Amino acid sequence: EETRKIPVPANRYTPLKENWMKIFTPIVEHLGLQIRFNLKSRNVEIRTCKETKDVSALTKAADFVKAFILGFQVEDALALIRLDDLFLESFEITDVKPLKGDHLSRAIGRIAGKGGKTKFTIENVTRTRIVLADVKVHILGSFQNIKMARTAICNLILGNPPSKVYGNIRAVASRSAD
Amino acid sequence: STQPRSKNESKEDKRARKQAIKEERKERRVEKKANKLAFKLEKRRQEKELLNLKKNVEGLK
Amino acid sequence: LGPQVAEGENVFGVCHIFASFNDTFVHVTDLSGKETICRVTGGMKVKADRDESSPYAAMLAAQDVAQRCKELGITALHIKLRATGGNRTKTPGPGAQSALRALARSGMKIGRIEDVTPIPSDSTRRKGGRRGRRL
Amino acid sequence: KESVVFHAYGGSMEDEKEDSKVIPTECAIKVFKTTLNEFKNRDKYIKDDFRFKDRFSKLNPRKIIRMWAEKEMHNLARMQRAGIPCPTVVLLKKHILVMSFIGHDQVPAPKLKEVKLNSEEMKEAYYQTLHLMRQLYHECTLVHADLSEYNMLWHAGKVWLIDVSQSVEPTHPHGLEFLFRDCRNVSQFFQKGGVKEALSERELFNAV
Amino acid sequence: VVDPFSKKDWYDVKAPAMFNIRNIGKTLVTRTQGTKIASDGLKGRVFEVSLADLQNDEVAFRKFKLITEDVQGKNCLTNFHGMDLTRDKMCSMVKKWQTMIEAHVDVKTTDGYLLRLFCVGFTKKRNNQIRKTSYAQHQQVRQIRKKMMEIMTREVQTNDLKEVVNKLIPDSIGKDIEKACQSIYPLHDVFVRKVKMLKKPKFELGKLMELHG
RNA sequence: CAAGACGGACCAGAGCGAAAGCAUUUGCCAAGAAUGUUUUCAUUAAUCAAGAACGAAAGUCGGAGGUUCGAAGACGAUCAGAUACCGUCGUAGUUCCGACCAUAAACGAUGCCGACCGGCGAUGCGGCGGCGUUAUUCCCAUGACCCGCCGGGCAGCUUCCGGGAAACCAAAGUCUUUGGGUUCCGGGGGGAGUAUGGUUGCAAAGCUGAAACUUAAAGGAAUUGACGGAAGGGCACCACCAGG
C-alpha cells in the first residue's frame, strides 16, 4: 500500500480542524481511503486500503486536501474531487512585476478590490476560484479558464485599471464561447 | 558598432572598442547639444514672430 | 527483456515531470539518473503550438511512457516534480498534475512525489523589465 | 422591416484609374432602419460571431447597424469570391450599402415563390439552390440561416441568393441547427412545388 | 531500428550494512563494448534513497545521496556520500513568527573523510506563551550557533564515518543540541539539514569490505 | 569543473542610521542611541547667512571583470491607416576600484528645539518588582514563559481635547480669548524654472534666475447621479408555455 501526506500550516490548522468531519466524510465515503492527522508531523495522511475502489482516487483525495489546506472553499474542494479536469494554478505576486513593500500590497488591492468585488467579478466571469494569499494567487478551474484568469490577474497586477481589466476579461470570456 | 564580444578577446582589443564607443558617445552628445541650441533659437524667433502677429497685422481693413 | 526479479518486488525508476509554459517533458531515468529510458515530449504527439502545454499532450505523453516502461519491465516510479524554476514561475503547472494523474491511471505504482525545482536562493535578474510581464 | 432597398441608376466615373471598380448601370441601395425598436432579437447572430464579438459587446445601435452593414458586405464579397450568384458590392457608406441590381429596366427580379416555373424549371432551380447551399457551406464557410422562398430570386434561369446580412459562420454555437432549418425550409418549398426528386430535410442537411 | 535496451544490462544496487533494507534496486547499464568498461562507466553514479526505503521505523523526510564504487558480478557496493532533507519538509518548517538558526561545519573525520555538514534550528513557542513573537536576540543566536558548531564537531571529529552515520539516522546530534540549548533559548525542531562531501580519501577495498560485510 | 552575481523563504506595520539606505558565517577595527548612576564639568545651549562632509538610480572620466538582464541597434507577427502592441538576439550600462556629477514622487507630500493637553492594549531596547513554569526535579546563582511599574522609541485602535474648507489630525491642538526661540519659503493662472548674466562642472548638466506678452479663472476637499455602451431581480394571455 501507499500513502500521501499533505503538510498543514498553523495558519489553517483550526480551519481544518473545524471542517475535519466535512473533509473526512467524502474522503472515506466516496473514495474509501483511511485518513489520519499526524499532530506530531502536523500532516494529513491519506492511505489506501483493501476498501479502495480504484486507482487515482488517492490522487484526487490529495488534490482535495491540498485545495482545503491552501485556503479554497470546502465546496470548491469537493467539486474538484468530483470533477475530472481540475487544476490548481498558483503564481507569486512578484513574478508579474518587480514590486517591493507598500506598492506590492497596493497591487494586491488591484487584484482584490473593495470587499473582494473585483475578485468576485473575475471569479464569476472566468468560472474560476481565486485565493489571494500574502504573496501568492492560487487559481482553480479549467485550463482555458485558468489561462484567462492568469491573463486578467497579471493585467490587473501590472498597473492597468480595474474597469478596463474587467472589460477585457469580459471580451475574452465572450470570445472564448463561454 | 553592434559587435557581440566573445570570451577570447584580450586587452588592447576591448580597450580600443570601448574607447571608440566612448568617442561616438561624446560626439553624439555634442550634436545633441547643438540640436537643442538650434531648436531653442528657432522657438525663440518663432515665438517673437507669433507675438508680433498678435501685436500687429491682424484685422480686416 | 528486463530485470530478472520475482513478481513481488517492483523495479523503481525516477520519472521527472518538467512542466514548462511551452510544453511538458516526461523523462524516465533509473534511480541513478545516468542512463535514461524514455523521454516523450509534448511535441511527440500534438502537431501544433498552442496544445503543447495543454493537459491533452501531457496525458498522451504519460500514456506513451507508461506503455514504454511496461514494455521494459519498469513497474514502479518515483516522481520528481519540476517547474522551470530560476527567476521564472516556481509553481508546477496543470500539465504536471495532468501527467501524474494519467500515469496513476495507467496502472503505475506511485512512489515518492518529490517537488524538485531548481529554486534559487536568490535570482540574478528577472527576465522581464521593470514595467511588467504577461500582458 | 430592418432595411429598405431602393433601385437607382448609377453614374459613370470619369476618373481613369486602373484600380477603379466598374459601376453598374442599375444599382440597389440598401439602407438599414436605425429608428425602429424591433431589432432587439438580432443579437443572437452577432454576439456569436468571433469577427465582431469584441465590437458587439460594446456597440451602440448606430454602431450595430454599421457592423451589420459591414458583415453583409463581407458576406456578399465572400459569396462573390466563391462564384455564387449574388449582388456585387460596389461601395459601402455607413448604414447604406450599394450593390448590383438584379433585373433589367429598373424592374427587380421576382422571388422564387412568386415565380411560376415549370416542372423542369423547378427541378433546375432546386438543383441550383442545393449547389449554392453546398458552395456556401463548403467554400464560403458560412450558413445563410435565413434561406427561404423569399430570399431567392430567379433571373435569366439562375437562382440568386440575397439577404446574407444574417449569415453566420459554421463554427457558431447554433450554425448547424440553423443550416438544418434552412435546408428543411428549402425542402418544404421544393415539395410544395411538385419536385419529386427533392430530398428530405435530414438528407439535405447531410448532403450540404 | 536496433533496440538499445537489448545491449543493456540490469545491475543490482544494494544498501550498505548500516541500513536494515538492503536491496535499493536495479540499474540500467550499457554493457562493455571493448573500449569502455561497463564497470568504470557506472563507477561515478549517485543514488537518491529515502530513509523509509532503508529503515522501516525511521522518518520519510530524509534523503540520501550515495555513491557506488565497486562491481561484484551484477552487484554494486555503494558508499555513503551525503544526506539532505526533503524540500516539502523544508517548506513545512519555516513558519512566519519563528527565528531560524543555520550553521555549517567543515569537519575532517578520523578516517580522512572531510565533510561539510549543515544544521537548521527553529525557536520554540512556550506552553503558556501568550506572546506571538518568539524572536531570539542576535547574541543568543550567536551563542547557540557556537555551541552548535562545538557540539557537532565534538561528536563528528572524534569519530569515523561509521559512528557519525550511526548517530545521524536517529539524529542523536539533534537531540543533543536541543537538550543543550534549553539553557539559552528553548528550541523547537533541530536537525542536521544537509551533509555535503568535501574530500574523499584514497579509494581501496577493505574499508568497503567491512562497510558491506 | 570554472565564472561572476545575489543573499529569498526566516522578514514582522519589527530594528538601526543625519538622510541616501542597511539581511550568508567568523574575526578585527573605530563608532553609536537608549537604559542605570547620591559620578564630573557648570550654562558650556536652540536655530542658523557665509562655509563644509554625506548624498538612491541614471550619467561622465581612468582600470579590471563581464553570470543574468538590458538603453541603443537587428528580427518576426498585426492590420481601411500601426509605425504603439507582442515574443527572438543584442552594445553602453548593470559589478568592483579611484575621481567628477549633487538630482528624484530624495514624501510623513508635515523644518528644528521646548512646555501643556484624553483613554486603551500590543511591540522593540534597557532597568526595577515579582505567585508560579522549564535547563531530564538543576546542588547556589543564572538563561527562556506569565503579571505589573518606569524611561526613550517604532507604530495601531478609539474620543464631542480642541482645530479645520473638509478629508482628516492627540497634533495639523493650546489662533480675532491672536506674542516660547529660531531657520527657510509662497503671494491668481500661463510665459517659466524660459532667456540673459554670474558661478560650479570634462561633458551632460547644476545653483541663482527675469521680463515682454497672455487669461478669468487655474486649483483644493467633500455631496448627489443625467448615464453606464454595469449587473440583478420583478411584472403583465393588450407577453410567453400548454392549448382554444
**DSSP-assigned letters across all residues of A111-159:** HH-STTHHHHHHHHHHT-EEEEETTEEEEEE-HHHHHHHHHHHHHHHTT
In a mutational test of the E interface, the residue from A1, A5, A40, A45 whose CB has the highest number of chain E CBs within 10 Å is A5
Any idea which residue has 499526524 for its cell? A38
How many angstroms separate the CA atoms of D50 and D47, rounded? 8
- β C109-115/C76-83 pair status: parallel
Q: Which three cell numbers stand for residue D73?
A: 458586405
* CA-to-C1' span, B22 to F203 (A): 12
3-state helix, strand, coil in chain B (%, to 5): 70, 0, 30
**Which B residues 4-23 have CB within 7 Å of strand F?**
4-5, 7, 11, 14-15, 18-19, 21-22
Residues 6+ apart with CB under 8 A from C105: A55, A56
**Which C residues 74-93 have CB within 7 Å of strand F?**
87
How many angstroms separate the CA atoms of D136 and D141, rounded? 6
Strand partners, C82: C18
Task: Give chains near D: 3+ CB pairs under 8 A.
Answer: A
Q: Is D146 a catalytic residue?
A: yes
Residues spanned by the domain of C114: 1-135
Name the amino acid, one letter, at C6.
A
Nearest to E83 by CA among E167, E159, E6, E23: E167
Instruction: Please check whether residue E1 lies inside any domain of the structure.
Output: no
Number of domains in chain E: 1
Strand partners, A89: A139
D30 is in an annotated binding site: yes
How many angstroms separate the CA atoms of B17 and D123, rounded? 84
Bases of chain F with protein Cβ within 7 A: 4-12, 24-27, 60-74, 86-87, 90-93, 122-126, 132-135, 138, 142-147, 194-195, 203-205, 212-214, 229-230
Within chain D, what is the greatest distance between any pair of CA atoms?
53
Residues of E in contact with C116 (CB under 8 A): 87
Please check whether residue E143 touches C, CB under 8 A. no
Alpha helix (H) residue ranges in chain A: 13-18, 20-29, 57-70, 74-82, 102-112, 117-126, 143-157, 162-175
Nearest 5°: CA angle at A157, between A151 and A161? 95
Q: What CATH number does the domain containing C26 carry? A: 3.30.420.80
How many angstroms separate the CA atoms of E69 and E77, rounded? 6
How many angstroms separate the CA atoms of C111 and C70, rounded? 16
CB contact under 8 A, E26 and C32: no
Please check whether residue A167 touches D, CB under 8 A. yes
Name the amino acid, one letter, at E69.
E
Strand partners, D111: D153
Q: Which three cell numbers stand for residue D44?
A: 443572437
How many angstroms separate the CA atoms of C33 and C13, rounded? 9
* Residue A96: exposure state from Cβ atoms within 10 A (0-12, 13-18, ≥19): buried
Residues spanned by the domain of E47: 6-213
Number of domains in chain C: 1
CB contact under 8 A, A7 and E91: yes
Kindly state the DSSP code that residue E40 receives in the 8-state scheme.
H
Please check whether strand F approaches the CB of E199 to within 7 Å: no
Nearest CB among A89, A92, A97 relative to C93 is that of A89
Instruction: State the DSSP H helix or E strand holding residue B43, giving kind and residue range, or none if neither.
Output: helix B14-55
Strand partners, E105: E117
How many angstroms separate the CA atoms of C67 and A118, rounded? 46
Strand partners, D168: D143
Phi, psi of D98 (to 5 degrees): -105, 125
Please check whether strand F approaches the CB of E139 to within 7 Å: no
D72 is in an annotated binding site: no
- β E8-14/E75-85 pair status: parallel
Please check whether residue D57 touches A, CB under 8 A. yes
In a mutational test of the C interface, the residue from A2, A54, A56, A140 whose CB has the highest number of chain C CBs within 10 Å is A56
> Closest-CA residue in chain C for E60?
C112
Please check whether residue E27 touches C, CB under 8 A. yes
Kindly state the DSSP code that residue D143 receives in the 8-state scheme.
B
Instruction: State the DSSP H helix or E strand holding residue E29, giving kind and residue range, or none if neither.
Output: strand E23-30
How many angstroms separate the CA atoms of D146 and D137, rounded? 14
Q: Which three cell numbers stand for residue E14?
A: 544494494
Instruction: Please check whether residue E103 lies inside any domain of the structure.
Output: yes
Please check whether residue C127 touches A, CB under 8 A. no
D187 is in an annotated binding site: no
Instruction: Please check whether residue E123 lies inside any domain of the structure.
Output: yes
- β D107-108/D103-104 pair status: antiparallel
Residues of E in contact with C75 (CB under 8 A): none
Strand partners, D154: D159
Nearest to A153 by CA among A87, A72, A94, A96: A96
How many angstroms separate the CA atoms of E15 and E68, rounded? 10
Which technique was the structure solved with, according to the deposited record?
cryo-EM
- Residue C96 Cα, gap to closest chain A Cα (Å): 10
Q: Record the resolution, in angstroms.
A: 3.7
> Closest-CA residue in chain E for C36?
E28
CB contact under 8 A, A167 and D58: yes
Any idea which residue has 534523503 for its cell? E63
In a mutational test of the C interface, the residue from A95, A99, A136, A151 whose CB has the highest number of chain C CBs within 10 Å is A95
Any idea which residue has 498558483 for its cell? A90
CB contact under 8 A, A7 and E96: no
For chain A, first and last CA: distance in Å?
A: 42
* CA-to-C1' span, D192 to F244 (A): 29
- β A34-38/A43-47 pair status: antiparallel
- Residue C97 Cα, gap to closest chain A Cα (Å): 7
